[PDB]
Amino acid sequence: TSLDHVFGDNSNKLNYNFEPMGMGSLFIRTMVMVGVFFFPVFIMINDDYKYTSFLDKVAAAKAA
Amino acid sequence: HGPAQTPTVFDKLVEVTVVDMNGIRHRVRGLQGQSLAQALVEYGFPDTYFFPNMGFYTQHIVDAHVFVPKEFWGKVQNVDPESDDGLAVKRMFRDIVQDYQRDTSFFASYITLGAEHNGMTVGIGPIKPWILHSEWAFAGVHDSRNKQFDKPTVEIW
């Protein structure tokens, strides 16, 4: 306590309850994080879908 | 540190009055931190008064059925009835005491002698016949002059 009159004392305490985040906030932020940090997975899934729909068009208009 | 008193055994002495099953009052001296069953053994009580603590990993501890007055009910140590120690006490009440049970019934190894026990009067409760193995049993009658203290070992086997 020899420096409390120079740099401040220990009377003011931290205002935080150390509690977990709310469930909806955690879910929404995790879904945004999955979308941002795993964007090659969505890009490649979209590539597979766009490729298979073209083969569907070919197989549809070919056998007619 | 200064001229304060040298430690004596009399500072740590605890005196308990014990009434055996014949009604004879006895003066029992013990030390602080020693259990009650140990002080009863070292006083010279017969071996028919004692029985194994029926828990796992503690059958080498001898124990006795004592009656404790209502003032000293809160100085018996606490046992969780859901834990394994609680099931040990339940086995002892189920098998050894049976219908000698009263509301003052405890077990002497669960009493750790301190200054709060100084002047407490207890009585030895009766027990039913029991057997652990061929070398440690009780037929049901307290007719034997052999002390528990004179046994060199407590044998689980």
Partner: protein, 58 residues
């Protein structure tokens, strides 16, 4: 009523008990005026006191 195996299973449906004891808080420095600001636009930005003591003196 009927005695079953459900009486013997220690189900994990008991909430943990907390205490009213005051928990530890680390000391932090003092912030004298710490009201959280949520408004992008505020009338306090164009307050006459602000105009008198910040903008107007030469």
């Amino acid at each position: 009523s009927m005695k079953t195996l459900a009486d013997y299973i220690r189900w994990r449906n008991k909430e943990p008990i907390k205490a009213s004891v005051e928990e530890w808080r680390p000391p932090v420095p003092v912030i004298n005026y710490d009201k959280p600001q949520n408004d992008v636009l505020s009338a306090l930005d164009k307050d006459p006191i602000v105009r008198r003591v910040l903008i107007n003196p030469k």
